[PDB]
Design a protein around this nucleic acid. Structure first.
Lengths: 205, 484
RNA sequence: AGUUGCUUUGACUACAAAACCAUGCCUCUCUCUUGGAGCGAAUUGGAUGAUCGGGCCGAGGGCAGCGUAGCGCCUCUUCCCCUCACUCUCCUUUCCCUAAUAUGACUUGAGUCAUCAAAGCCUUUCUGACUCAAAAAUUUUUUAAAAAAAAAAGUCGCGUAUU
């Protein structure tokens, strides 16, 4: 299957004690909103569907063990909101792009979730870490060179439908002292960057 | 401090108990057996207690319906040297009437001294009369109090009004409220509650709008969530919806102490209205008010959800109750048992029936009643027989005897008529004979014709005189005396 | 005859709330002991956007010393941390308010009022729970028969793909 579906439960009581009690139960507080609420201008702050959520610990941990921790902000999901736990009735539904987890540095338990609606045709900025494939087969790496990881994330601006969850490059064709620029990175032609690329590669041997 | 010198923390451990008595008596659980065992173990000890400690213990034991251990503790501690006052004698009189009956309470009141026969004892005996529904002796106490000029409190008038409401003479309440207003007695909130209930029982919905405005005019009574519970019940039974929602939202505002019964009232009132989103709105507040939720809230919630047709929500609530239950409550099973027999998914109901007694829930009678409901809907009669036998073998859970419903008995006998199952009819009649000594309204009076298959029994109208002088329809004896 | 028992022991706290409609199967199936959802504040947060300032990495030509690879000097802005606005959805420390903390609000000033067989033992007898004795039930093994056994759930961890 292609994408994941996140089941959510509404919230009406907000606070530190209520949050700690929901975590005592095993429910993690969260929010969903459009991007227009995040603009500095109240003129561009339009009709915002800001809404409070709570999420299931087992489902969140299952998704995290499935997809990986630092890649979470890149991939999108399908949010389904229902009145009660396991209800046969739904309130709303849609697609969402996450940007923020909260986790304690001691145990790593999820504390807060921040969610942005990702409707059809929405243009969203996103920061995507890159994936290097073909390490074991790189001739520069085999002959004595090392692959210096230069840049981690790249800025992408485009539709909600076609944001990649990960950025892949091909480094199996590089000998020693060889580099591949960001313009040679395989990505969608309708996708824009808004990044200062200049004379900088993603990798170098 | 000087206000309370007999402190329970700083007291001696050689003379007194190490923990309070109302904490000690509930160590092993709230069950009757464990409370009795704790009391027996305590009365044999050499540690002592305070008089206020015993008083609060009596109140806590009374607040959960534990009347026999409360009476036993009161009698033994009075016998050991703790002198009853007038208030304690009123409480002990009520406890005697609660445990050994009103005939014992009357003897205790007679054996009370004359200077102890004051307004507290009179009001306690009046309440123990009205709770046992003896109108003639009630009024015989009333005219004696009015003759002796004993101060009649508002509690006595509310007890009489609740007696009137329960007996069926609910028209006397509007006269009585003006009587107690003429005799310079201020009312409480329960006075308005029973006034509202009697007015709604008199088929007068428009009268409950002039009482709420009068108590708003009074300004002396505090409105409480029980008032809005009465308003919500009356309006929901009357079919009005928006006024019921206003009453219930005021009820939610008035519930500042997070009362479990109040939350149960919200759940059942919003379920009987039918609004699923606010049912879950109150439910999440209930889970935010108690993390280890008892089985009673689940019993209300899942029944509300299945009466509002949310079956996978009920199925997930079942798993939550399974993963967090300490006592395997059988009523929780029996809600969705009847659900799965009503919507016909009988294999999962049978699976729950099989798996309940292993996990620790023995079958009561209502599960078998729901399964014989399923079998009488689907037409199988032998399995209905096998269900009703186990149902009457189990009996009721309070010590009663289980009796099948008249409509189900009538339908089962109409099913017996077609297949000419005379053996099944005889077994059902024997079961009803064991159940009840009467056995007849429509059970066999027009139902001799199930014998119209091959021959008939010997006695020729003499068996039908045996079971306490039944009378049959005029069109029933013709095929009887035709075959003699 | 001498010892040990028979030899009294307690309370004093001022308190009628025990009268309830909903669903109802014994509806608290067992609640002893849980801080707040205040539209309440101060440091901190930040789901947000730029300016100013400072500070790495790095990018080239080079002045520079080799047959690839250099040591100081020289043109640069991404990136981080501040700063000014928006800002209450997660987090830390406090303060106010509410709830809770067992009721209510001089005469033991050397007393008044109860108790005065407790603790054991032996016969019955009503009602519950447990061990079961053993049989009928289902799985495996052995040769339709004979031996031993679980059934129902939660939790952790591993490797692997079906909307």
């Amino acid at each position: 299957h292609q994408y994941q579906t996140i089941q959510a439960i509404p919230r009406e009581a907000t606070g530190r004690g209520v949050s700690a009690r929901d975590r005592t139960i095993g429910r993690i507080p969260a929010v969903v909103f459009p991007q227009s609420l995040l603009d500095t201008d109240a003129s561009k702050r339009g009709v915002s569907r800001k809404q409070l959520l709570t999420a299931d610990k087992k489902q969140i941990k299952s998704i995290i063990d499935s997809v990986g921790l630092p890649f979470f902000c890149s991939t999108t999901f399908q949010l389904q909101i229902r009145a009660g736990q396991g209800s046969s009735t739904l309130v709303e539904s849609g697609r969402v792009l996450p940007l923020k987890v909260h986790r304690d540095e001691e145990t790593g338990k999820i504390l807060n979730l921040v969610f942005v609606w990702a409707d059809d045709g929405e243009k969203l900025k996103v920061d995507v870490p890159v994936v290097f494939k073909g390490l074991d087969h790189c001739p520069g790496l085999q002959k004595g060179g090392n692959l210096r990881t230069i840049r981690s994330t790249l800025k992408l601006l485009g539709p909600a439908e076609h944001i990649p969850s990960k950025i892949e490059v091909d480094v199996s064709n590089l000998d020693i002292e060889d580099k591949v620029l960001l313009q040679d990175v395989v990505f969608h032609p309708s996708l824009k960057l808004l990044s200062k690329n200049e004379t900088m590669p993603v990798c170098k041997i | 401090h000087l206000s309370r010198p007999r402190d329970i923390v700083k007291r001696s451990t050689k003379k007194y108990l190490d923990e309070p008595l109302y904490h000690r008596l509930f160590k092993d659980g709230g069950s009757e057996v464990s409370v009795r065992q704790q009391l027996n173990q305590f009365l044999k000890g050499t540690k002592h207690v305070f008089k206020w400690e015993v008083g609060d213990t009596i109140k806590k034991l009374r607040s959960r319906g534990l009347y026999y251990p409360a009476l036993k503790l009161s009698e033994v501690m009075e016998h050991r040297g703790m002198n009853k006052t007038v208030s304690d004698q009123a409480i002990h009189l009520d406890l005697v009437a609660k445990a050994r009956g009103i005939a014992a309470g009357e003897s205790y009141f007679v054996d009370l001294p004359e200077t102890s026969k004051t307004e507290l004892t009179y009001a306690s005996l009046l309440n123990c009369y009205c709770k046992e529904l003896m109108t003639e002796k009630a009024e015989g106490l009333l005219n004696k109090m009015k003759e002796l000029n004993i101060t009649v409190s508002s509690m006595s008038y509310n007890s009489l009004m609740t007696l009137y409401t329960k007996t069926g003479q609910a028209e006397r309440v509007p006269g009585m409220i003006q009587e107690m207003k003429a005799e310079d007695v201020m009312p409480d909130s329960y006075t308005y509650n029973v006034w509202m209930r009697a007015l709604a029982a008199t088929e007068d919905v428009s009268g409950v709008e002039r009482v709420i405005e009068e108590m708003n005019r009074d300004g002396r009574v505090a409105p409480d969530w029980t008032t809005y519970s009465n308003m919500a019940s009356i309006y929901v039974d009357a079919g009005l919806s928006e006024k019921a929602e206003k009453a219930l939202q005021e009820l939610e505002m008035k519930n500042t102490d997070r009362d479990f019964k109040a939350y149960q009232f919200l759940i059942t009132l919003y379920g009987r209205l039918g609004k699923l989103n606010e049912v879950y709105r109150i439910w999440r507040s209930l889970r935010l008010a108690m993390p280890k939720t008892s089985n009673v809230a689940y019993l209300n919630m899942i029944q509300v959800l299945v009466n509002l047709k949310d079956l996978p929500g009920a199925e997930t609530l079942f798993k939550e109750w399974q993963a967090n239950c300490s006592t395997y409550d059988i009523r929780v099973v029996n809600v969705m048992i009847g659900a799965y027999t009503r919507e016909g998914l009988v294999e999962k109901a049978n699976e729950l029936k099989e798996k309940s007694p292993r996990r620790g829930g023995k079958l009561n009678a209502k599960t078998w009643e729901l399964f014989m409901d399923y079998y009488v809907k689907r037409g199988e009669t032998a399995q209905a027989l096998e269900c009703i036998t186990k149902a009457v073998s189990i009996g009721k859970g309070d010590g009663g005897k289980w009796l099948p419903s008249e409509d189900t008995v009538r339908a089962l006998m109409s099913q017996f008529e077609e297949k000419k199952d005379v053996n099944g009819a005889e077994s059902l009649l024997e079961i009803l004979k064991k159940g009840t000594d009467d056995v007849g309204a429509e059970t066999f009076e027009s139902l001799i014709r199930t014998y119209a298959a091959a021959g008939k029994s010997h006695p020729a109208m003499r068996q039908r005189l045996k079971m306490e002088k039944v009378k049959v329809d005029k069109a029933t004896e013709k095929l009887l005396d035709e075959l003699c």
